[PDB]
Amino acid sequence: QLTPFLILLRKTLEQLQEKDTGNIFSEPVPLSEVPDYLDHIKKPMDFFTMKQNLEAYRYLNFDDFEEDFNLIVSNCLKYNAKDTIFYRAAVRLREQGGAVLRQARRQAEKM
């Protein structure tokens, strides 16, 4: 059965994906194209992996959800040079996504 909290996480995940207009963060960074990625990044994350986590009841709280979103952004800032589309997109996502999360955390607190 559905819970209000899990419904809120689903809603919030959709709102975050809407902010990623180019679908830069929809799926894992492809190791075939970026063969040194795991040399630098210890815990890859992306929205499809978050959707999998959400549906396996691994976000028992909001914190753990926000932490995975923040990894999407921090991994991208860490890996990519500043003068890239990826780095700029992660800065934009940090800005827009942070605002989605702040509002969503307020709703979570009422539960």
Ligand X SMILES: CCc1ccc(S(=O)(=O)Nc2cc3c(cc2OC)n(C)c(=O)n3C)cc1
Least separation, in Å, of the C-beta of 37 and ligand X? 6
Cβ neighbours for 88, distance < 8 A, ≥ 6 positions apart: none
Residue 25 or 62 having the CB closest to ligand X = 25
Q: How far is CA 19 from CA 6, 7, 24, 32, 76, in A?
A: 20, 19, 10, 26, 16
Applying CB under 6 A, the residues found at the interface with ligand X are 24-25, 29-30, 33-34, 76, 79-80, 85-86
Check the chain for breaks (C–N over 2.5 Å) and list the residue before each, or none.
Answer: none
Residue 25 or 59 having the CB closest to ligand X = 25
Residue 9 or 24 having the CB closest to ligand X = 24
Least separation, in Å, of the C-beta of 40 and ligand X? 10
